[PDB]
Write an enzyme that holds these catalytic residues in place. Structure first.
Site, PDB file in Angstrom:
ATOM      1  N   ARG A  62      35.310  38.041  28.961  1.00  0.00           N
ATOM      2  CA  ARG A  62      35.923  39.121  28.194  1.00  0.00           C
ATOM      3  C   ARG A  62      34.921  40.268  28.109  1.00  0.00           C
ATOM      4  O   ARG A  62      33.888  40.154  27.432  1.00  0.00           O
ATOM      5  CB  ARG A  62      36.323  38.638  26.799  1.00  0.00           C
ATOM      6  CG  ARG A  62      36.905  39.760  25.905  1.00  0.00           C
ATOM      7  CD  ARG A  62      38.329  40.140  26.325  1.00  0.00           C
ATOM      8  NE  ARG A  62      38.627  41.534  25.998  1.00  0.00           N
ATOM      9  CZ  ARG A  62      39.277  41.941  24.913  1.00  0.00           C
ATOM     10  NH1 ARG A  62      39.718  41.062  24.008  1.00  0.00           N
ATOM     11  NH2 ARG A  62      39.492  43.239  24.734  1.00  0.00           N
ATOM     12  N   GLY A  63      35.219  41.371  28.801  1.00  0.00           N
ATOM     13  CA  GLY A  63      34.221  42.424  28.927  1.00  0.00           C
ATOM     14  C   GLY A  63      33.764  42.984  27.592  1.00  0.00           C
ATOM     15  O   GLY A  63      32.567  43.202  27.379  1.00  0.00           O
ATOM     16  N   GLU A  64      34.704  43.211  26.672  1.00  0.00           N
ATOM     17  CA  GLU A  64      34.358  43.829  25.398  1.00  0.00           C
ATOM     18  C   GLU A  64      33.351  42.991  24.630  1.00  0.00           C
ATOM     19  O   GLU A  64      32.591  43.528  23.819  1.00  0.00           O
ATOM     20  CB  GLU A  64      35.610  44.060  24.553  1.00  0.00           C
ATOM     21  CG  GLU A  64      35.909  45.531  24.298  1.00  0.00           C
ATOM     22  CD  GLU A  64      37.319  45.763  23.778  1.00  0.00           C
ATOM     23  OE1 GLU A  64      37.960  46.749  24.205  1.00  0.00           O
ATOM     24  OE2 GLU A  64      37.787  44.953  22.948  1.00  0.00           O
ATOM     25  N   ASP A  65      33.329  41.681  24.871  1.00  0.00           N
ATOM     26  CA  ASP A  65      32.340  40.800  24.258  1.00  0.00           C
ATOM     27  C   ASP A  65      31.016  40.753  25.018  1.00  0.00           C
ATOM     28  O   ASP A  65      29.947  40.830  24.404  1.00  0.00           O
ATOM     29  CB  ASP A  65      32.864  39.373  24.157  1.00  0.00           C
ATOM     30  CG  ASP A  65      34.009  39.222  23.164  1.00  0.00           C
ATOM     31  OD1 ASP A  65      34.159  40.078  22.261  1.00  0.00           O
ATOM     32  OD2 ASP A  65      34.740  38.218  23.284  1.00  0.00           O
ATOM     33  N   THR A  66      31.057  40.556  26.339  1.00  0.00           N
ATOM     34  CA  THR A  66      29.871  40.107  27.060  1.00  0.00           C
ATOM     35  C   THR A  66      29.531  40.889  28.324  1.00  0.00           C
ATOM     36  O   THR A  66      28.571  40.517  29.010  1.00  0.00           O
ATOM     37  CB  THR A  66      30.009  38.619  27.435  1.00  0.00           C
ATOM     38  OG1 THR A  66      31.131  38.439  28.313  1.00  0.00           O
ATOM     39  CG2 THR A  66      30.208  37.733  26.197  1.00  0.00           C
ATOM     40  N   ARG A  67      30.249  41.975  28.635  1.00  0.00           N
ATOM     41  CA  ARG A  67      30.061  42.657  29.918  1.00  0.00           C
ATOM     42  C   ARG A  67      28.638  43.158  30.110  1.00  0.00           C
ATOM     43  O   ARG A  67      28.055  43.003  31.191  1.00  0.00           O
ATOM     44  CB  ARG A  67      31.055  43.815  30.029  1.00  0.00           C
ATOM     45  CG  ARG A  67      30.685  44.924  30.969  1.00  0.00           C
ATOM     46  CD  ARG A  67      31.616  46.125  30.732  1.00  0.00           C
ATOM     47  NE  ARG A  67      33.016  45.796  31.011  1.00  0.00           N
ATOM     48  CZ  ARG A  67      34.002  45.859  30.117  1.00  0.00           C
ATOM     49  NH1 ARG A  67      33.755  46.244  28.870  1.00  0.00           N
ATOM     50  NH2 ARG A  67      35.245  45.552  30.478  1.00  0.00           N
TER      51      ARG A  67
ATOM     52  N   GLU B 138      44.129  35.221  33.979  1.00  0.00           N
ATOM     53  CA  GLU B 138      43.035  34.811  34.854  1.00  0.00           C
ATOM     54  C   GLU B 138      42.755  33.319  34.715  1.00  0.00           C
ATOM     55  O   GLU B 138      42.649  32.594  35.712  1.00  0.00           O
ATOM     56  CB  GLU B 138      41.803  35.638  34.502  1.00  0.00           C
ATOM     57  CG  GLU B 138      40.651  35.546  35.437  1.00  0.00           C
ATOM     58  CD  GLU B 138      39.640  36.635  35.119  1.00  0.00           C
ATOM     59  OE1 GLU B 138      38.797  36.406  34.226  1.00  0.00           O
ATOM     60  OE2 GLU B 138      39.731  37.731  35.725  1.00  0.00           O
TER      61      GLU B 138
ATOM     62  N   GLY C 154      45.946  48.288  35.349  1.00  0.00           N
ATOM     63  CA  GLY C 154      47.280  47.918  35.783  1.00  0.00           C
ATOM     64  C   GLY C 154      47.980  46.962  34.820  1.00  0.00           C
ATOM     65  O   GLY C 154      47.352  46.230  34.065  1.00  0.00           O
TER      66      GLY C 154
END
Ligand SMILES: Nc1ncnc2c1ncn2[C@@H]1O[C@H](COP(=O)(O)O)[C@@H](O)[C@H]1OP(=O)(O)O
Length: 169
Positions: free
Chosen positions: A12-17, A78, A44
């Site tokens: 999850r990018g907002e957490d760990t990107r 995913e 998309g």
């Protein structure tokens, strides 16, 4: 069967990107573990065909479960694809390695805490996906992985990447 990557990194990018997943990605590369880690901006409606293809051409997936992972319908789609490959793919199989990044594995397994909270934000247009999402989370949380809590994170990543290396060979 075509194999482009040793590892597909789900996160999850907002957490760990910018932090844990970036350090994990570079640690995997330092071991020669070919890793797919998306850094494109995705807007998309559906999961990008590039991502679905990378999963199908990966020897394994590493899942970075974090507090808000289940609040993204794209992360959950995913995960369903990953767990589908884990069941169907052969020669080679698709291994799955879950990382519980500052989250309780039972919260992922049972959809409690922030993983239970997440489902309240999904409307009726997602009604048919919710059972598949829960099934995939439970299946993933039962696989042997690494619970991470507060502690020296460079050594945590070193042990995880050393373990993935030995399990892929
Ligand atoms: N089309 C999309 N594909 C993938 N993730 C999306 C998409 N739209 C939104 N998101 C995720 O939901 C968050 C909130 O979006 P918005 O504020 O526009 O409603 C985004 O930061 C992104 O989180 P992330 O970057 O962790 O993947």
């Amino acid at each position: 069967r075509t194999i482009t990557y040793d590892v597909f990194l789900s996160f999850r990018g907002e957490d760990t990107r910018f932090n844990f997943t970036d350090h994990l990605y570079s640690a995997l590369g330092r071991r020669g573990i070919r890793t797919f880690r998306d850094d494109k901006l995705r807007r998309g409606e559906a999961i990008a065909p590039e991502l679905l293809k990378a999963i199908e051409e990966s020897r394994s997936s590493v899942i970075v479960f974090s507090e808000n992972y289940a609040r993204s319908r794209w992360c959950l789609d995913e995960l369903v694809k990953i767990m589908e490959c884990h069941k169907d793919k052969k020669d080679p199989g698709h291994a799955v390695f879950p990382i519980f990044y500052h989250v309780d594995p039972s919260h992922v397994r049972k959809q409690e805490g922030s993983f239970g909270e997440a489902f309240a934000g999904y409307g009726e247009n997602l009604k048919d996906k919710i059972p598949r999402w829960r099934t995939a989370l439970t299946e993933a949380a039962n696989l042997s992985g690494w619970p991470l809590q507060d502690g020296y994170e460079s050594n945590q990543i070193k042990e995880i990447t050393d373990s993935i290396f030995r399990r892929l060979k």
